[PDB]
Amino acid sequence: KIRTLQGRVVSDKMEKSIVVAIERFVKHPIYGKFIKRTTKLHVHDENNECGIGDVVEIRECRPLSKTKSWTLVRVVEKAV
Amino acid sequence: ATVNQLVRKPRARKVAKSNVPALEACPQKRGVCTRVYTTTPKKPNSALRKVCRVRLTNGFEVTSYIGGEGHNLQEHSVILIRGGRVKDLPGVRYHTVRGALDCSGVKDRKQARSKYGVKRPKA
Amino acid sequence: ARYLGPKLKLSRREGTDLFLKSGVRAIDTKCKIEQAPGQHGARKPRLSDYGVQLREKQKVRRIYGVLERQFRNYYKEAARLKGNTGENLLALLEGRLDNVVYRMGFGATRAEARQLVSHKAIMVNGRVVNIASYQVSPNDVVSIREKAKKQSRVKAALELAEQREKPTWLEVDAGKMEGTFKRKPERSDLSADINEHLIVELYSK
Amino acid sequence: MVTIRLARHGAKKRPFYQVVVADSRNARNGRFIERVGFFNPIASEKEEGTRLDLDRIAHWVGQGATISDRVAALIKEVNKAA
Amino acid sequence: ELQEKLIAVNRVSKTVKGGRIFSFTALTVVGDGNGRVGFGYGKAREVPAAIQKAMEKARRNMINVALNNGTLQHPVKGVHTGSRVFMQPASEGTGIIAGGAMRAVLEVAGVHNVLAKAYGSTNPINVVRATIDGLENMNSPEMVAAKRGK
Amino acid sequence: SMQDPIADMLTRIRNGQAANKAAVTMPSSKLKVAIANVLKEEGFIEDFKVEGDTKPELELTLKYFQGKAVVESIQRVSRPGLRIYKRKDELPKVMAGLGIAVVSTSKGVMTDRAARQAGLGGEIICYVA
RNA sequence: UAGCUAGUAGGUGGGGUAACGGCUCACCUAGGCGACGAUCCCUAGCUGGUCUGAGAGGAUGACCAGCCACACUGGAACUGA
RNA sequence: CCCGCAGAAGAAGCACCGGCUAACUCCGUGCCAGCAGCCGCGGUAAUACGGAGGGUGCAAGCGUUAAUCGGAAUUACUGGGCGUAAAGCGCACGCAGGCGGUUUGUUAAGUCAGAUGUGAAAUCCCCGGGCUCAACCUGGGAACUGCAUCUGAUACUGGCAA
Ligand SMILES: [Mg+2]
Ligand SMILES: [Mg+2]
Ligand SMILES: [Mg+2]
Ligand SMILES: [Mg+2]
Ligand SMILES: [Mg+2]
Ligand SMILES: [Mg+2]
Ligand SMILES: [Mg+2]
Ligand SMILES: [Mg+2]
Ligand SMILES: [Mg+2]
Ligand SMILES: [Mg+2]
Ligand SMILES: [Mg+2]
Ligand SMILES: [Mg+2]
Ligand SMILES: [Mg+2]
Ligand SMILES: [Mg+2]
Ligand SMILES: [Mg+2]
Ligand SMILES: [Mg+2]
């Protein structure tokens, strides 16, 4: 792996059109407090397998669609 | 107060209303003399202060002060004006560059001639 | 660029001899020094801290015959350079050629010493340097051009040059009219009656 | 093709060239790939006047760069080994 | 090393049947140049009467200050009424830069190379004072070990 | 609300001290302790004491040197509202060096003199002098 | 300005490009975005850096260099690496 | 760049001087004429108007206007306030959000460490070098406080468990 991403599912309800949330804490560049800056990513997963609430590991590939540059790698946990 | 608070809504710095729309930050502006009044000053003072309402190159009509002792400026004279209020004459926020365009310099001035626009007298 | 105006007037206002008529007579008088720099000079200048702080740097300035712009830049250089800002300032002020010409006696007063410089009548390590502010560094070697040597001025110049306390940081002939800036003058050389820290303050705020 | 040439970072009447490797199509004093020497043609006889990292110039030429006319001269004027 | 200076002199009015009766006030500082500084106030119907009356007050009402060379050990904050002040050791560049007013107490008190600044009201009576107290509270660069050690 | 105990410690001290109070107690915790440690080991308190089991009770003995209290000032620095973290090179020094700053690191709660020597850094819990 | 979105979001296949790709098409899924501020409106070329400030900041983007974009306005392609 | 030639010969102005602010007098004028960055000056002795003598400041510039930041801790992150001065919503309940007692395990995102790559040159800064000095030019460092990857550390924070 040249890097990977974790993040929780959020939306499984679409023919491989899976979208994953990614949560980082970051120091406010001005008032020093740490806040949650979220990222959403449109990730491919052939034969639809993850489910809303799943933690998942993810890698950056080429464009699979005007929107998708990431396929999944593994699953982690379920039935949140 | 709160950190959160500043986070949501940052400290904002009040912007500076100018005291002299010589439009767009301009060293001075050209204009034409609408009227050549002379009115009287505020509270403590008492006088007959020369002025002139001036249609500026940029459309603004503005009342401007005429500095010095004595001046030949009438309606239709083309002048140059600079920043410079006159507290005494509320409403007046610009001066007129003596010895510019059709504005004459002050007759006979010896001291401080460059203000009031007077040539170095043939000494 | 040069002051050019009646020059005793200065000392009188500064209240001290700035050595600008330097030449013959000493301990002025035969002038008027002090009690009337103008028409109200008779009067006591009970003056602000700003005033005393002003006249000090003014004094130093009227002395080396330097105008504001350059002086400011001296000060800035001083401050840049490590060491006591005020001392460095004084150092720089001495490193001036014109000064290290009057200081080797080749000229009655610094003004005269300078006329020499600008009149291509000096040579550092061999070569002619006619610009009054040429900074002179240790081991340098400032001579009088053969052309116009032992000519008028330069004689009496080198003369009462010995009447003066007479340097230390510089060793100097008198026959050849050459001489060697041996080292940068220390605080303790020169001074007493000049108060850097003030003219550091003037330029601090 | 890439080339080794003189940029003129001098100063009216007292030139001082940088010698650079760059896309031959760019401006004389423009975007370049890497610097590789310099050339003060008012060097004065005192000391320095034409330093020139040869082993790089070597690399690029090896990779197909062309050289100027003047630079070429400097390399065969630096002598090369001594 | 007597060393003294006055900081501010001021007029004030009293107001009685017959009008305003005026008077002057003096604010002074005296130090030895080796720690020990004091300020005095003292007012009086005329100027010299007041400045004198002050210098005296300042001779007593003198505190001492645990310097460290020509400077301060740690940076210190001082604050009295509307005046809130702050000064810093400053591995002396040259040093002694502050608002002529607390330069005064600094200078005489013997500190040789600080940078300082006054916030809040520049009112002399309260800055030169916020500064005295400022140096006062400042604690010994070792009698902190006295403090601890144990 | 309880929300920030560590300030409450720093404070129960600051206060009792100003109340020339001999001792002072409070609910304990892994963390309170590690700091009470540095506080004693740096000689700002006499000695601590945790007397309980299900409902532990930190207890600190205060000090007074001259007439004064020994702790001349104790402030939070990090806090729930706003966490502070410094890298090693960017660690702070109180009163120029006198007095100290408690910093928690991946190798435990230690002083600034300490963490500095340990070549690392962490969350700067509080200042003390 | 609080909702925005039909090639819209994804899939499958055909076509397409030097190239991945809703790039395009046909068909299917009903999705995609959004108060961590979408949509709408106003203003604006970005940077290295420039001035100021003890710093943190504030302000700014001539002259030098890097990137983008434009070539009377709008729209087009041809030739060609 | 160098040498000769003549003769001080061709070469000084601008603003200011009531306080802040370095620099004071006389004459005119008389709430007029006028000044004025702020305060405020002018109705008979005006250091504040205008002129003169004198002075102070700058100098081939000097003043005026315009413009940015500074002083302004006057949007206060560093670094502020809301009883009476500007400022607590008339009161409560509560979604999102923020924050959250105490223990052990685990996680390693925040946090911290190291390593590597990258952070264009110029500019800034430090030490030098070259133009009679300087501005200007230039060698070499230093700096670019940043970003990413890898591996580590687990006290604090976040997650999971009980
Ligand atoms: Mg000049
Ligand atoms: Mg396809
Ligand atoms: Mg500041
Ligand atoms: Mg077109
Ligand atoms: Mg083609
Ligand atoms: Mg005065
Ligand atoms: Mg005037
Ligand atoms: Mg009169
Ligand atoms: Mg500010
Ligand atoms: Mg306030
Ligand atoms: Mg109120
Ligand atoms: Mg209420
Ligand atoms: Mg806890
Ligand atoms: Mg660079
Ligand atoms: Mg040189
Ligand atoms: Mg935990």
Burial grade of A64 (CB within 10 A; 0-12, 13-18, 19 or more): middle
Measured distance CA(E110)–CA(E88) in Å, rounded: 15
Nearest to D15 by CA among D27, D24, D6, D5: D6
Look up residue E135 and give its two tokens: 């140096």
The reply to whether F33 touches chain A by the CB within 8 Å rule is: no
CA of A58 to C1' of G3 (A): 31
User: Measured between CA atoms, how close is B61 to chain F, in angstroms?
Assistant: 54
> Are C101 and C80 part of one and the same domain?
no
Residue C47, domain member (yes or no): yes
Measured distance CA(E142)–CA(F95) in Å, rounded: 12
Measured distance CA(B99)–CA(B49) in Å, rounded: 19
Q: Which domain holds residue C165?
A: 94-181
Measured distance CA(E65)–CA(E34) in Å, rounded: 9
Bridge partners of A23, per DSSP, are A38
Residue C58, domain member (yes or no): yes
Bridge partners of E37, per DSSP, are E31, E63
Q: What angle do CA E72, E74, E76 make, to 5 degrees?
A: 90
| Alpha-carbon dihedral F15, F20, F22, F28, rounded to 10 degrees | 10
The owner of tokens 């209240």 is C15
CA of F89 to the centre of ligand 11 (A): 47
Burial grade of A46 (CB within 10 A; 0-12, 13-18, 19 or more): exposed
CA of B13 to the centre of ligand 9 (A): 9
Q: Which residue of A has its CA nearest to B8?
A: A31
Annotated domain spans of chain B: 1-123
Locate breaks in chain F with C to N over 2.5 A; list the residue preceding each: none
Measured distance CA(B3)–CA(B7) in Å, rounded: 6
The reply to whether E150 touches chain F by the CB within 8 Å rule is: yes
Residue C2, domain member (yes or no): no
Measured distance CA(C45)–CA(C36) in Å, rounded: 11
**Residues in chain F within 8 Å Cβ distance of E148:** 42-44, 70
- Tally the residues of chain A: 80
Nearest to E54 by CA among E20, E98, E10: E10
- The answer to whether C157 and C107 have CB atoms below 8 angstroms apart is yes
In chain G, which nucleotides are within 7 Å of a protein Cβ?
Answer: 9-11, 20-23, 28-34, 36, 58-59, 64-67
* D17 CB closer than 7 A to any strand H atom: no
Contacts 24+ apart (CB under 8 A), D14-21: D14/D42, D15/D41, D15/D42, D16/D40, D16/D41, D16/D42, D17/D41, D19/D52, D19/D71, D19/D74, D21/D56, D21/D57, D21/D60, D21/D65
Write out the H or E segment, with its range, that includes residue F72. none
Q: How many helices (H) and strands (E) does chain B have?
A: 1, 6
- The answer to whether B57 and B85 have CB atoms below 8 angstroms apart is no
> Are C62 and C52 part of one and the same domain?
yes
Largest CA distance in chain F: 42
Look up residue E37 and give its two tokens: 């500084």
The reply to whether E89 touches chain F by the CB within 8 Å rule is: yes
Question: DSSP 3-state assignment of F37?
Answer: helix
Show the beta-strand stretches assigned E in chain E: 4-13, 22-31, 37-40, 43-44, 62-63, 76-80, 83-88, 115-120
Count: domains in chain D: 1
Cα–Cα distance list, D47 to D51, D77, E58 (Å): 11, 16, 68
Measured distance CA(C26)–CA(C19) in Å, rounded: 9
Cβ pairs C/E, distance under 8 A: 9
> What angle, 0 to 180 degrees and rounded to 10, lies between the N-to-C axes of helices F30-41 and F5-18?
40
Q: Which residue of A has its CA nearest to B7?
A: A31
For D17, residues 6+ apart whose C-beta sits below 8 A from its C-beta are D6, D7, D8, D9, D10, D38, D39, D40, D41
Nearest to A56 by CA among A80, A40, A78, A26: A78
Locate breaks in chain C with C to N over 2.5 A; list the residue preceding each: none
List alpha helices for chain C, DSSP H.
8-14, 49-64, 68-80, 85-95, 99-102, 110-118, 154-160, 196-201
* CB-CB neighbours of E81 under 10 Å: 13
The reply to whether A34 touches chain F by the CB within 8 Å rule is: yes
The reply to whether B4 touches chain F by the CB within 8 Å rule is: yes
Question: DSSP 3-state assignment of A23?
Answer: strand
DSSP string, B47-99: --EEEEEEEETTS-EEEEE--SS-----TT-EEEEEE---TTSTT--EEE-TT
User: Class assignment of domain B1-123?
Assistant: mainly beta
Q: Which domain holds residue D54?
A: 1-81
Bridge partners of C53, per DSSP, are none
Q: What per-residue string of b and e applies to B61-75 under the rule 16 or more CB within 10 Å gives b?
A: ebbbbbbbeebebee
**Residues in chain F within 8 Å Cβ distance of B4:** 81
CA atoms within 13 A on the CB side of F82: 15
Look up residue B26 and give its two tokens: 């301009």
Question: DSSP 3-state assignment of E136?
Answer: helix
- CA dihedral for C157, C160, C165, C171, sign (positive or negative): positive
> Are C75 and C19 part of one and the same domain?
yes
Please tell me the experimental approach by which this structure was elucidated. Answer: X-ray
- The answer to whether A64 and A71 have CB atoms below 8 angstroms apart is yes
Q: What angle do CA B2, B5, B6 make, to 5 degrees?
A: 95
Instruction: Choose, out of F44, F65, F113, the residue to mutate when testing the contact with E (most E CBs < 10 Å).
Output: F65
Do chains B and E touch by CB distance (3+ pairs < 8 Å)? no
Measured distance CA(E5)–CA(E51) in Å, rounded: 10
> What is the DSSP secondary structure assignment for residue F89, as one 8-state letter?
G
* CB-CB neighbours of E36 under 10 Å: 17
The reply to whether B7 touches chain F by the CB within 8 Å rule is: no
What are the φ/ψ torsions at residue F98 (nearest 5 degrees)? Answer: -55, 160
Residue C76, domain member (yes or no): yes
* A26 CB closer than 7 A to any strand H atom: yes
> Are C149 and C199 part of one and the same domain?
no
For B15, residues 6+ apart whose C-beta sits below 8 A from its C-beta are none
Q: Which residue of A has its CA nearest to B4?
A: A33
Q: What angle do CA C144, C145, C150 make, to 5 degrees?
A: 65
Sequence letter at residue D79:
N
* C50 CB closer than 7 A to any strand H atom: yes
E97 contacts C204? CB cut-off 8 A: yes
Burial grade of C89 (CB within 10 A; 0-12, 13-18, 19 or more): buried
Measured distance CA(D62)–CA(A11) in Å, rounded: 56
Burial grade of B18 (CB within 10 A; 0-12, 13-18, 19 or more): exposed
Which nucleotide, over all strands, has the C1' atom closest to the CA of D25? G81
For C165, residues 6+ apart whose C-beta sits below 8 A from its C-beta are none
User: Measured between CA atoms, how close is F70 to chain E, in angstroms?
Assistant: 6
Beta-sheet strand order (sheet of F108-110): F74-76, F123-128, F100-105, F108-110
Measured distance CA(C55)–CA(C194) in Å, rounded: 11
Instruction: List the end-to-end C-alpha distance of chain F, in Å, as a whole number.
Output: 27
Do chains E and F touch by CB distance (3+ pairs < 8 Å)? yes
Question: DSSP 3-state assignment of E35?
Answer: coil
For D81, residues 6+ apart whose C-beta sits below 8 A from its C-beta are none
Bridge partners of D76, per DSSP, are none
Write out the H or E segment, with its range, that includes residue D5. strand D2-8
Measured distance CA(D6)–CA(F120) in Å, rounded: 49
Nearest to E116 by CA among E93, E141, E96: E96
The reply to whether C180 touches chain E by the CB within 8 Å rule is: no
Do chains F and D touch by CB distance (3+ pairs < 8 Å)? no
Measured distance CA(D27)–CA(D11) in Å, rounded: 18
Resolution (A): 2.9
Q: What per-residue string of b and e applies to F96-120 under the rule 16 or more CB within 10 Å gives b?
A: bebbbbbbbbeeebbbbebbbebeb
CA of C35 to the centre of ligand 16 (A): 84
The reply to whether F82 touches chain B by the CB within 8 Å rule is: yes
Q: Where do the domains of chain F lie, and which CATH numbers do they carry?
A: 1-71 (3.30.1370.30), 72-129 (3.30.1490.10)
E89 contacts F98? CB cut-off 8 A: no
Burial grade of B91 (CB within 10 A; 0-12, 13-18, 19 or more): exposed
* C80 CB closer than 7 A to any strand H atom: yes
Q: Which residue of B has its CA nearest to F79?
A: B3
User: Measured between CA atoms, how close is A24 to chain F, in angstroms?
Assistant: 16
* F54 CB closer than 7 A to any strand H atom: no
